[PDB]
Enzyme design. Structure first.
Site, PDB file in Angstrom:
ATOM      1  N   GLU A 268      43.206  33.815  52.730  1.00 21.18           N
ATOM      2  CA  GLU A 268      43.140  34.224  53.826  1.00 21.18           C
ATOM      3  C   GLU A 268      43.519  32.901  55.010  1.00 21.18           C
ATOM      4  O   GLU A 268      42.640  32.885  55.757  1.00 21.18           O
ATOM      5  CB  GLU A 268      41.848  35.066  54.455  1.00 21.18           C
ATOM      6  CG  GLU A 268      40.679  34.070  54.196  1.00 21.18           C
ATOM      7  CD  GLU A 268      40.099  34.180  52.717  1.00 21.18           C
ATOM      8  OE1 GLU A 268      40.693  34.438  51.791  1.00 21.18           O
ATOM      9  OE2 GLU A 268      39.011  34.198  52.620  1.00 21.18           O
ATOM     10  N   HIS A 292      43.300  43.208  52.908  1.00 22.45           N
ATOM     11  CA  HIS A 292      42.230  42.647  52.813  1.00 22.45           C
ATOM     12  C   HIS A 292      42.374  41.009  53.464  1.00 22.45           C
ATOM     13  O   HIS A 292      41.357  40.643  54.010  1.00 22.45           O
ATOM     14  CB  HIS A 292      42.203  42.153  51.109  1.00 22.45           C
ATOM     15  CG  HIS A 292      40.924  41.434  50.584  1.00 22.45           C
ATOM     16  ND1 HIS A 292      39.886  42.045  50.162  1.00 22.45           N
ATOM     17  CD2 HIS A 292      40.688  40.120  50.719  1.00 22.45           C
ATOM     18  CE1 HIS A 292      38.910  41.035  49.687  1.00 22.45           C
ATOM     19  NE2 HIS A 292      39.630  39.898  50.075  1.00 22.45           N
ATOM     20  N   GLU A 293      43.393  40.437  53.259  1.00 23.22           N
ATOM     21  CA  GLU A 293      43.624  39.118  53.974  1.00 23.22           C
ATOM     22  C   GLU A 293      43.689  39.165  55.555  1.00 23.22           C
ATOM     23  O   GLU A 293      42.824  38.425  55.992  1.00 23.22           O
ATOM     24  CB  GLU A 293      44.869  38.571  53.582  1.00 23.22           C
ATOM     25  CG  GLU A 293      45.008  38.310  51.863  1.00 23.22           C
ATOM     26  CD  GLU A 293      43.783  37.712  51.442  1.00 23.22           C
ATOM     27  OE1 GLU A 293      43.248  36.757  51.704  1.00 23.22           O
ATOM     28  OE2 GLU A 293      43.585  37.969  50.171  1.00 23.22           O
ATOM     29  N   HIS A 296      39.950  39.418  56.675  1.00 25.39           N
ATOM     30  CA  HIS A 296      39.242  38.165  56.498  1.00 25.39           C
ATOM     31  C   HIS A 296      39.264  37.285  58.009  1.00 25.39           C
ATOM     32  O   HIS A 296      38.424  36.519  58.127  1.00 25.39           O
ATOM     33  CB  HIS A 296      39.928  37.336  55.534  1.00 25.39           C
ATOM     34  CG  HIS A 296      39.203  37.261  54.051  1.00 25.39           C
ATOM     35  ND1 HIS A 296      37.819  37.305  53.898  1.00 25.39           N
ATOM     36  CD2 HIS A 296      39.895  37.430  52.927  1.00 25.39           C
ATOM     37  CE1 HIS A 296      37.545  37.344  52.620  1.00 25.39           C
ATOM     38  NE2 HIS A 296      38.937  37.519  52.051  1.00 25.39           N
ATOM     39  N   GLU A 315      33.025  38.388  51.011  1.00 26.96           N
ATOM     40  CA  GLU A 315      34.083  39.570  50.198  1.00 26.96           C
ATOM     41  C   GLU A 315      33.770  40.974  50.464  1.00 26.96           C
ATOM     42  O   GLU A 315      34.458  41.571  50.632  1.00 26.96           O
ATOM     43  CB  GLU A 315      34.226  38.936  48.725  1.00 26.96           C
ATOM     44  CG  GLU A 315      34.609  37.829  48.712  1.00 26.96           C
ATOM     45  CD  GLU A 315      36.174  37.573  49.157  1.00 26.96           C
ATOM     46  OE1 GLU A 315      37.022  38.643  49.431  1.00 26.96           O
ATOM     47  OE2 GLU A 315      36.581  36.717  49.625  1.00 26.96           O
ATOM     48  N   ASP A 372      34.558  28.106  40.335  1.00 33.37           N
ATOM     49  CA  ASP A 372      35.733  28.636  39.733  1.00 33.37           C
ATOM     50  C   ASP A 372      35.176  29.513  38.618  1.00 33.37           C
ATOM     51  O   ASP A 372      35.987  30.487  38.051  1.00 33.37           O
ATOM     52  CB  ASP A 372      36.745  27.672  39.423  1.00 33.37           C
ATOM     53  CG  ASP A 372      37.357  27.004  40.827  1.00 33.37           C
ATOM     54  OD1 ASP A 372      37.179  27.878  41.598  1.00 33.37           O
ATOM     55  OD2 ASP A 372      38.046  25.943  40.706  1.00 33.37           O
ATOM     56  N   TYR A 380      32.852  41.152  45.477  1.00 32.65           N
ATOM     57  CA  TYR A 380      33.711  42.085  46.082  1.00 32.65           C
ATOM     58  C   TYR A 380      33.019  43.432  45.898  1.00 32.65           C
ATOM     59  O   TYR A 380      33.059  44.068  47.064  1.00 32.65           O
ATOM     60  CB  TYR A 380      35.135  42.056  45.247  1.00 32.65           C
ATOM     61  CG  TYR A 380      35.854  40.868  45.526  1.00 32.65           C
ATOM     62  CD1 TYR A 380      35.571  39.650  44.688  1.00 32.65           C
ATOM     63  CD2 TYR A 380      37.165  40.742  46.438  1.00 32.65           C
ATOM     64  CE1 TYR A 380      36.350  38.393  44.770  1.00 32.65           C
ATOM     65  CE2 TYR A 380      37.855  39.446  46.387  1.00 32.65           C
ATOM     66  CZ  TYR A 380      37.423  38.255  45.802  1.00 32.65           C
ATOM     67  OH  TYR A 380      37.984  37.016  45.935  1.00 32.65           O
TER      68      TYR A 380
HETATM   69  C1  LIG Z   1      37.028  31.035  45.202  1.00 35.15           C
HETATM   70  C2  LIG Z   1      36.892  30.558  43.797  1.00 35.15           C
HETATM   71  C3  LIG Z   1      35.417  30.327  43.515  1.00 35.15           C
HETATM   72  C4  LIG Z   1      34.463  30.879  44.328  1.00 35.15           C
HETATM   73  N1  LIG Z   1      33.320  31.003  43.737  1.00 35.15           N
HETATM   74  C5  LIG Z   1      31.994  31.453  44.472  1.00 35.15           C
HETATM   75  C6  LIG Z   1      31.290  32.606  44.029  1.00 35.15           C
HETATM   76  C7  LIG Z   1      31.920  33.157  43.132  1.00 35.15           C
HETATM   77  C8  LIG Z   1      31.235  34.568  42.403  1.00 35.15           C
HETATM   78  C9  LIG Z   1      30.102  34.818  43.105  1.00 35.15           C
HETATM   79  N2  LIG Z   1      29.690  34.171  44.059  1.00 35.15           N
HETATM   80  C10 LIG Z   1      30.067  33.212  44.452  1.00 35.15           C
HETATM   81  C11 LIG Z   1      34.707  31.620  45.438  1.00 35.15           C
HETATM   82  C12 LIG Z   1      36.052  31.771  45.742  1.00 35.15           C
HETATM   83 ZN   LIG Z   2      38.978  37.545  49.470  1.00 34.12          ZN
END
Ligand SMILES: c1ccc(NCc2cccnc2)cc1
Ligand SMILES: [Zn+2]
Ligand SMILES: [Yb+3]
Ligand SMILES: [Yb+3]
EC number: 3.3.2.6
Length: 607
Positions: A268, A292-293, A296, A315, A372, A380
Site C-alpha cells: 500500500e 485491500h490496498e 490501507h 491488516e 518476515d 489478516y
Molecule cells: C510485512 C512483513 C512482515 C511483517 N511482520 C509483522 C507481523 C507478522 C505477523 C504477525 N504480526 C506481525 C509484517 C508485514
Molecule cells: Zn495488507
C-alpha cells in the site's frame, strides 16, 4: 518499546522529514547518496542518537556543515547494525536539527531486488524495486526504522535517462542530471507524514495509462493494456472507500504492476500501490487485492500500528474495509462468501503452525523474532474475524462502519496500539459496554489457535462449493464416471477457487480422483493464479507426477510468496519431486528476491 528497532525511540527524538538525494547505479547494484534527516529532540540536553542501518556503507555524517563522530555497532542478525551519532551541540526539548548522512547500499540489500534485462518484459533494460515492510527501510537508508515515527519526505533520484523512477509520493518533475548527461533526475514530494516502511522506489522502463480521474497504471509497455482493463474498477472502489473511511488525503492513487518476482500480492505504498502481475487474470476476478490496498490509505497509512506486535490493527481493519468494498460492488451475499473463505484460510494457518504456536496469537511478541518469519494470514484473518464478530455483536454493518469511520478520524496521522483501539471501541460503544464485556478479550487478543467464537456467515454462495467438494471426497472409483464438465456450469471463478480450497483441506485425495478431475474439468487450462495454485497443490499433495513440472514452473516463473513458498514446500514433501525442488531452488536462489530466497531456503531446510 519497538523490539524490532535498534534506533532511539520516539520518546527520545523524532524524525520529522527526510530529504533523499541519491543515484541508482545498475553497474554496481548500489544506491548512493545522502539522507538528510530533520530530527526533533524530545529530551533536554540530548547529545547523541541512534539510527537503524542494515548492510549500509557510511561515508560521513554532517551537521552544521561539519563532519561529526559516529559509530556502527555489531550486527544483530536481521535487525542490522545500530549507528550512534554524536551531536556537536546538546539539544533542548523540541529543538530541530538536520543531520546529513552520506551512504551507499549493498547489492544484497534485503529491501531491494535488482533485475537484469532478461528478468524484465522488454529484455533491454534493467529494473530495480523496493519493499520496505516491515523492517527493510534500514537496508536502503539510515533511519528510525519503526512505525511509531512519522515523517514527510522529498527525494531527487538520478537514474539512466532511458529509465523512469517512481516513489510513494507525488511526482514533482524531471530534469537532465547536471553531473552526468547520460542521466535524469526525478523529483518527489510526500507532504503527508508516513512511517518509513511506506517509503518505496521503482526504477525501470515504465509506461503509464490513465484509468480514472486520479489513477494511472504503470508497468512495462507489454503489460499496460492488460493492467488498465484488469484494474478498471479502481475509481469506483476509491469512491466507496471514501464513503466508508472519510476523505482520501493522498492526492493521487496510482498503480504499479511489478515484475513477477514481487513478493506480495500488493503493498500500500502511498500515492503508488505496488501489485503482483499474478493479478492479471483477464477478468478482474482478483480485484479484491486492489480493494485491500485502497483501504490501507485509511487503515495502516493514516492510522498506523505503533510496533509490529500490533500489525493486526493494520491488516484486520483493512480486510474488514476490503470486504465491505466488494460487498457494496457485488452484494452482501458475496461479502459473506469472502468472509467465510477467510475463516477457512485462518483454519489452514492455525493447522500449519499448530494450535498453540505463538504466531497464531493476534497480538504477537516479536522480541528476537524476524518479522518476515512470523508473517502469515493470522493478523489478516483472525483480525478480520474479531471485527466481524464485533459487527454482529454490536448490531450490524451499518453501526460498525460508524465506528470504523470514527476510529480513522480519531487516530489519523498517529501510531497506536491494541489498547488504544480497545479503549476507543469502549468509548465509542459506551452504551453497549455490557455486550463488550461478554467478549473473551484475553482469548481473542492474546491466546493462540482459532478464535473462541465463530461468527455467523450466510452460506448462499458457499453451499454449491461444499456440496461438490463433498461429492468428490466421498466418491469411490465407481462414482468417478458421474462427474462431468456440467458440474461447473453455474460456478463463478470465485466458487471454483472455493471448491478447490475446500477439497485441498482434505488432501490428499486418491490419485485416480485427481486424474478424473483433470479429465472432466481441465483445471490445467486455467491461468487464474489463485485457482491454479490450489489445483497444483492438490495434485502434488495427491502424488500426481504429471503435475511436478507444472508446479515447478509456477513456483519459479513468478515469486509471490503466497504461491511460491507452499508450492516449493509441497514439492519438497513429495518424494518424487524432492530432489528437483531443492535443485531448482539452488539454481534460482541468486536471482530471487532476497527475502523470498531466505524464506524458501528456511522452508526447504536448505543452507
Ligand atoms: C510485512 C512483513 C512482515 C511483517 N511482520 C509483522 C507481523 C507478522 C505477523 C504477525 N504480526 C506481525 C509484517 C508485514
Ligand atoms: Zn495488507
Ligand atoms: Yb536516557
Ligand atoms: Yb459404489
Amino acid at each position: 518499546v519497538d523490539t524490532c528497532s535498534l534506533a532511539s525511540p520516539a520518546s527520545v527524538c523524532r524524525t520529522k522529514h527526510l530529504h533523499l538525494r541519491c543515484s541508482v547505479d545498475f553497474t554496481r547494484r548500489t544506491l548512493t547518496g545522502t539522507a538528510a534527516l530533520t530530527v526533533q529532540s524530545q529530551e533536554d540536553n540530548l547529545r547523541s542518537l541512534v539510527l537503524d542501518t542494515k548492510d549500509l556503507t557510511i561515508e560521513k555524517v554532517v551537521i552544521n556543515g561539519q563532519e561529526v563522530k559516529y559509530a556502527l555497532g555489531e550486527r544483530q542478525s536481521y535487525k542490522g547494525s545500530p549507528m550512534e551519532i554524536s551531536l556537536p551541540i546538546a539539544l533542548s526539548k523540541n529543538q530541530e536539527i538536520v543531520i546529513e548522512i552520506s551512504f551507499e547500499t549493498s547489492p544484497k540489500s534485503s529491501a531491494l531486488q535488482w533485475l537484469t534485462p532478461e528478468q524484465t518484459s522488454g529484455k533491454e533494460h534493467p529494473y530495480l524495486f523496493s519493499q520496505c515492510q516491515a523492517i527493510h527501510c534500514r537496508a536502503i537508508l539510515p533511519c528510525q526504522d519503526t512505525p511509531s515515527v512519522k515523517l514527510t519526505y522529498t527525494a531527487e533520484v538520478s537514474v539512466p535517462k532511458e529509465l523512469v523512477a517512481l516513489m510513494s509520493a507525488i511526482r514533482d518533475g524531471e530534469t537532465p542530471d547536471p553531473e552526468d548527461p547520460s542521466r535524469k533526475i526525478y523529483k518527489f514530494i510526500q507532504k503527508v507524514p508516513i512511517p518509513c516502511y511506506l517509503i518505496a522506489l521503482v526504477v525501470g522502463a515504465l509506461e503509464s495509462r490513465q484509468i480514472g480521474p486520479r489513477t494511472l497504471v504503470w508497468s512495462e509497455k507489454e503489460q499496460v493494456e492488460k493492467s488498465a482493463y484488469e484494474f478498471s474498477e479502481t475509481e469506483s472502489m476509491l469512491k466507496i472507500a471514501e464513503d466508508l473511511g472519510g476523505p482520501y488525503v493522498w492526492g493521487q492513487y496510482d498503480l504499479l504492476v511489478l515484475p513477477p518476482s514481487f513478493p506480495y500480492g500488493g503493498m500500500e505504498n502511498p500515492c503508488l500501490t505496488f501489485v503482483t502481475p499474478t493479478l492479471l487474470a483477464g477478468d478482474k476476478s482478483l480485484s479484491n487485492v486492489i480493494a485491500h490496498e485502497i483501504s490501507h490509505s485509511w487503515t495502516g497509512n493514516l492510522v498506523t500500528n505503533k510496533t509490529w506486535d500490533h500489525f493486526w490493527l493494520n491488516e484486520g481493519h483493512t480486510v474488514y474495509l476490503e470486504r465491505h468494498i466488494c460487498g457494496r460492488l457485488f452484494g452482501e451475499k458475496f461479502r459473506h462468501f469472502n468472509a467465510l473463505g477467510g475463516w477457512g484460510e485462518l483454519q489452514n494457518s492455525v493447522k500449519t503452525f499448530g494450535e498453540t504456536h505463538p504466531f497464531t496469537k493476534l497480538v504477537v511478541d516479536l522480541t528476537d523474532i524476524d518479522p518476515d518469519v512470523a508473517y502469515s494470514s493470522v493478523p489478516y484473518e483472525k483480525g478480520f474475524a474479531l471485527l466481524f464478530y464485533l459487527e454482529q455483536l454490536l448490531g450490524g454493518p451499518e453501526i460498525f462502519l460508524g465506528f470504523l469511520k470514527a476510529y480513522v478520524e480519531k487516530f489519523s496521522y498517529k501510531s497506536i496500539t491494541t489498547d488504544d483501539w480497545k479503549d476507543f471501541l469502549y468509548s465509542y460503544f459506551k452504551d453497549k459496554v455490557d455486550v463488550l464485556n461478554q467478549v473473551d478479550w484475553n482469548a481473542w487478543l492474546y491466546s493462540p489457535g482459532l478464535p473462541p467464537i465463530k461468527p455467523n456467515y450466510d452460506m448462499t454462495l458457499t453451499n454449491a462449493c461444499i456440496a461438490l467438494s463433498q461429492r468428490w471426497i466421498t466418491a469411490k472409483e465407481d462414482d468417478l464416471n458421474s462427474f462431468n464438465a456440467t458440474d461447473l456450469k453455474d460456478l463463478s471463478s470465485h466458487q471454483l477457487n472455493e471448491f478447490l480450497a475446500q477439497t485441498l483441506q482434505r488432501a490428499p485425495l486418491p490419485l485416480g480422483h485427481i486424474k478424473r478431475m483433470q479429465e472432466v474439468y481441465n483445471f490445467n487450462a486455467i491461468n487464474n493464479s489463485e485457482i491454479r495454485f490450489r489445483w497444483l497443490r492438490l495434485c502434488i499433495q495427491s502424488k500426481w507426477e504429471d503435475a511436478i513440472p507444472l508446479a515447478l514452473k509456477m513456483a519459479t516463473e513468478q515469486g509471490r510468496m503466497k504461491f511460491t513458498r507452499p508450492l516449493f514446500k509441497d514439492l519438497a514433501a513429495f518424494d518424487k519431486s524432492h530432489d528437483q525442488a531443492v535443485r531448482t531452488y539452488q539454481e534460482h536462489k541468486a536471482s530471487m528476491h532476497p527475502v523470498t530466497a531466505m524464506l524458501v531456503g528456511k522452508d526447504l531446510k536448505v543452507d
